Amino acid sequence: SMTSHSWLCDGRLLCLHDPSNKNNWKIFRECWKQGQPVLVSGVHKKLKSELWKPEAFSQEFGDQDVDLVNCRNCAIISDVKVRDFWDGFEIICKRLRSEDGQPMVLKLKDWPPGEDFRDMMPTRFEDLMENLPLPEYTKRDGRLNLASRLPSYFVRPDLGPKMYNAYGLITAEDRRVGTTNLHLDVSDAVNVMVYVGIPIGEGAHDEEVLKTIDEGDADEVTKERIHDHKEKPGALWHIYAAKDAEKIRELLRKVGEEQGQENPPDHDPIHDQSWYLDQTLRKRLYEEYGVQGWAIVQFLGDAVFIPAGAPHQVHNLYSCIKVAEDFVSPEHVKHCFRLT
Ligand SMILES: [Cl-]
Ligand SMILES: [Cl-]
Ligand SMILES: [Cl-]
Ligand SMILES: [Cl-]
Ligand SMILES: [Mn+2]
Structure with missing residues (x-):
C-alpha cells in the first residue's frame, strides 16, 4: 500500500514517500530539530524529465569554456568545452584519457558559474523550485526560510541552485576515492538526484557497485530497494551530526601526523x-572516538536534506546529475551566526 513514510539506517533516518504531501512538515520537523538528515523519495516523477538529460545540456551549452577535475588525483583539466564532459557521461569510449590510456573519472567544476543558473537556465530553474519538497523551508521566500530575513551578523547563502555533475567511480582502487571529499556548509541544503547514467562499452559493472554499498555500511532495508524494486542507485553519502565535527577534526589531525603531514595543531x-x-577511517572514527554516521544511498529522484554544520562526503556509484538549493531553517540558524 501507499504509506506516508518509512525508516532507513535502522530507524535513525526518516524517508518521506510523497514529495508534495501538505502534511510532511509534521513528521519532518521532529527529526530535523534533533540534527538528523532526512530523505524524500519520488521528486523525479514531478519534474519535466526531458530538461534533465545529459544530451540536452551538451546540445544547448556544449560550446561554453570550463575546467574539469580528475576525481582519482584532484588534478585540474583547464580550458576545455562543456561538450567534452557531457559526450562522455554514459559512453565510456568518448571520455578524455589520462597518460596511462584509461578513461578518466571527471567532475564538471563551477558550472553554471557562480549565481548564473537562473539566467542561463530559466525553464530548469522554474521546474526545480516549483517541485522542491518542504516548500515552506526550501523556497527562496518560504515562511520558514530565514535566508532573506537575517542581518549581516548571520552568513547568508548565495543565490542557487548549484549543480553537482560527475562520472561514477569504477574500480576496486576507486572504492577509497571521494567524488566530493568531507566538508561542511554553514546553511541547510536540499540535494536532488535528477538523472542517473548507467554506462555502456564497459557495461556489466553491476557487482563492484554491490561491494561498494556493502563495505559502505548501507543498512539491510536500503539493500532491498535495489534487489526488489529495481530503482537506479546514484551515489553513496556519509553524513555526520554537526555536534561531532570537532571529534572528526581530532581523528584527521592524528592520521595526518601518522602519514607525516606537517600541520599546526x-x-x-x-x-x-x-x-x-x-572503510578503515570510518571504523576508527566509531571505535576510537565513539562517532557514528548515516550511510545513505541516493537513488534517482531522492532529495537529501543536509543539516547546517553536518560534515558530509559523496561517492558516485554511476554518472549523476544533482541540483541543490541552500536555505536557513530557524532550527539551525546558530551555525551561520558570526559571534560567540
Ligand atoms: Cl544543530
Ligand atoms: Cl532552461
Ligand atoms: Cl513545508
Ligand atoms: Cl572535493
Ligand atoms: Mn556539501
Missing part, C-alpha cells in the same frame, strides 16, 4: 576538503 582538516573517510 589547530589546522582545520574538514575546511581543507582534502579527506575521504574509507
Whole structure:
C-alpha cells in the first residue's frame, strides 16, 4: 500500500514517500530539530524529465569554456568545452584519457558559474523550485526560510541552485576515492538526484557497485530497494551530526601526523576538503572516538536534506546529475551566526 513514510539506517533516518504531501512538515520537523538528515523519495516523477538529460545540456551549452577535475588525483583539466564532459557521461569510449590510456573519472567544476543558473537556465530553474519538497523551508521566500530575513551578523547563502555533475567511480582502487571529499556548509541544503547514467562499452559493472554499498555500511532495508524494486542507485553519502565535527577534526589531525603531514595543531582538516573517510577511517572514527554516521544511498529522484554544520562526503556509484538549493531553517540558524 501507499504509506506516508518509512525508516532507513535502522530507524535513525526518516524517508518521506510523497514529495508534495501538505502534511510532511509534521513528521519532518521532529527529526530535523534533533540534527538528523532526512530523505524524500519520488521528486523525479514531478519534474519535466526531458530538461534533465545529459544530451540536452551538451546540445544547448556544449560550446561554453570550463575546467574539469580528475576525481582519482584532484588534478585540474583547464580550458576545455562543456561538450567534452557531457559526450562522455554514459559512453565510456568518448571520455578524455589520462597518460596511462584509461578513461578518466571527471567532475564538471563551477558550472553554471557562480549565481548564473537562473539566467542561463530559466525553464530548469522554474521546474526545480516549483517541485522542491518542504516548500515552506526550501523556497527562496518560504515562511520558514530565514535566508532573506537575517542581518549581516548571520552568513547568508548565495543565490542557487548549484549543480553537482560527475562520472561514477569504477574500480576496486576507486572504492577509497571521494567524488566530493568531507566538508561542511554553514546553511541547510536540499540535494536532488535528477538523472542517473548507467554506462555502456564497459557495461556489466553491476557487482563492484554491490561491494561498494556493502563495505559502505548501507543498512539491510536500503539493500532491498535495489534487489526488489529495481530503482537506479546514484551515489553513496556519509553524513555526520554537526555536534561531532570537532571529534572528526581530532581523528584527521592524528592520521595526518601518522602519514607525516606537517600541520599546526589547530589546522582545520574538514575546511581543507582534502579527506575521504574509507572503510578503515570510518571504523576508527566509531571505535576510537565513539562517532557514528548515516550511510545513505541516493537513488534517482531522492532529495537529501543536509543539516547546517553536518560534515558530509559523496561517492558516485554511476554518472549523476544533482541540483541543490541552500536555505536557513530557524532550527539551525546558530551555525551561520558570526559571534560567540
Ligand atoms: Cl544543530
Ligand atoms: Cl532552461
Ligand atoms: Cl513545508
Ligand atoms: Cl572535493
Ligand atoms: Mn556539501
